[PDB]
Amino acid sequence: KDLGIDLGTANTLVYVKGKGIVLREPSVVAIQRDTKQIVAVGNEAKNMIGRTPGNIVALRPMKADYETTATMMKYYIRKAIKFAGKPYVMVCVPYGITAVEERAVIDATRQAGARDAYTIEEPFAAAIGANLPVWEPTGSMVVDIGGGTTEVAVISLGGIVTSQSIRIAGDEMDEAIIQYIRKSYNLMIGERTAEAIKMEIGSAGNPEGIGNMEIRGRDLLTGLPKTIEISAEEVAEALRDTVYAIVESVKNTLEKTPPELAADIMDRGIVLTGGGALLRNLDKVISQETDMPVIVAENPLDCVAIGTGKALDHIDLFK
Ligand SMILES: Nc1ncnc2c1ncn2[C@@H]1O[C@H](COP(=O)(O)OP(=O)(O)OP(=O)(O)O)[C@@H](O)[C@H]1O
């Protein structure tokens, strides 16, 4: 029974042909500090972390190493198959991926127990998962904003016409908030607080009425913890350059798009997928700066994984 696997920078999802998303686990491993060997993956790692056995540290590999990939894929595949035979595995990969890296991904999935492994670029999977008409001779456009990358693509006739990837996404919005608070308040906050600010009062623009938030961090003069209040308006300033860079990759992908496909997209709209697509008003801001309709996909966190699974029905194209 064939599997689609989305090993995301923070979240891993496994799709099983005929069952849907059957596995939702963090992209994390636990490694024994001294032996440097992986001893748990995903939920087994997170729970081992909560048992606290010492001599063990958690890592986020997808934030790269062939054996880590193989070990993680072996866990997720074995965990997902609740067994009819060695599976055929569709592996979602970032659009940037090079040939040597793509073959390293296939070989490690084979090592993990796949009969054979195929890859699908993330924007293509997201477009399939967002129900864009990717097989028709008309233009479609998806912007997938994850934790590590923003991937923009124009799809037509079952393939990517043009596509761009930038390393400016969810994690970079967090960093922009950290850096803004550092410069403005001489206060250093951690990544957990930055993430919460982004989710609770973050916006791409027009932050009126979103509200304010009390946050805590380290005063950089005294080194002592300090509490301040930050506003939606400030957070939107903090995120301005990140948002501008996403807008610019959408524009730059359009400028590389043939004219008729560009016309189809202006008519049907751009679809935003991924967790970063939930930044408040990002759809409106991309719409305003490009003069195009922009909508956030239904089920934006699962589009990629569902698209990876639906690609199993078209295994011939990826073989
Ligand atoms: N409400 C929200 N507002 C803004 N960002 C959010 C929200 N919810 C989640 N995110 C962001 O979504 C990102 C993770 O999204 P997603 O699960 O699609 O990524 P991923 O698949 O793990 O990563 P990648 O696609 O880069 O491999 C994180 O940066 C997270 O902060």
In sign, the C-alpha dihedral spanning 34, 38, 44, 46 is positive
Show the ligand 1 pocket: residues with CB < 6 angstroms: 8-11, 146-149, 169-171, 195, 198-199, 202, 274-276, 278-279, 301
Q: What is the distance between the alpha carbons of residues 217 and 209, in angstroms, rounded to a whole number? A: 25
User: Dmax over Cα atoms in the chain, in whole Å?
Assistant: 62
Element (H, E) at 298: none
In the chain, which ranges are E strands?
3-7, 11-16, 20-26, 29-32, 38-41, 56-59, 88-93, 116-121, 140-145, 150-156, 159-166, 187-188, 212-219, 225-231, 270-273, 294-296
Nearest-atom number in ligand 1 for the CA of 301 is 18
Beta carbons of 232 and 210 less than 8 angstroms apart: yes
Encoded tokens for 292 = 């195009």
- Using DSSP, state whether 211 is helix, strand or coil: coil
Q: Give the CA-trace dihedral at 80, 314, 98, 149, to 10 degrees.
A: -70
Query: Could you give the CA distance from residue 270 to residue 299 in angstroms, rounded to a whole number?
Result: 15
Decide the pairing of beta strands 212-219 and 187-188: antiparallel
Q: Which of 77, 94, 95 is nearest to 86 (CA)?
A: 77
CA dist., res. 170 & res. 238, Å (int): 13
Cα–Cα distance measured from residue 131 to residue 119, given in angstroms and rounded to the nearest whole number? 19
Domain spans in the chain, listed from the N-terminal domain onward: 1-130+301-319, 137-167+243-300, 169-242
DSSP-derived letter for residue 239 is: T
* H-type alpha helices, 269-302: 282-290
Helix axes 240-255, 282-290, angle to 10 degrees: 50
Q: How far is CA 287 from CA 205, 251, 290, in A?
A: 12, 11, 5
What's the Cα-to-Cα distance from 141 to each of 147, 157, 175, rounded to whole Å?
A: 20, 12, 28
Which residues have CB under 8 Å from 45's CB, separation 6+? 26, 28, 29, 30, 58
Q: Which residues does 17 contact at the CB level (< 8 Å), separation at least 6?
A: 1, 2, 3, 4, 309, 312, 313
Closest CA to 239 of 173, 187, 167: 173
* C-alpha dihedral, 92 to 96 to 100 to 104, nearest 10°: -30
Give me 54's structure tokens: 């010492």
Q: Is residue 28 within 8 Å of residue 44, measured between CB atoms?
A: no
Task: Report the binding-site residues for GTP.
Answer: 9-11, 147, 195, 198, 275
Which residue's CA is the nearest one to ligand 1's atom 21? 8
Q: Which amino acid is at 114?
A: A
| Cβ-proximal residues to 113 (8 Å cutoff; 6+ apart), any chain | 73, 74, 77, 78, 86, 87
Binding positions for ATP are 9-11, 147-149, 195-198, 275-278
Helix ranges, 256-313 (H):
259-268, 282-290, 303-310
Determine the residue of 143, 198, 243, 304 to mutate for testing ligand 1's pocket, defined as the one with the most ligand atoms within 8 A of the Cβ atom. Answer: 198
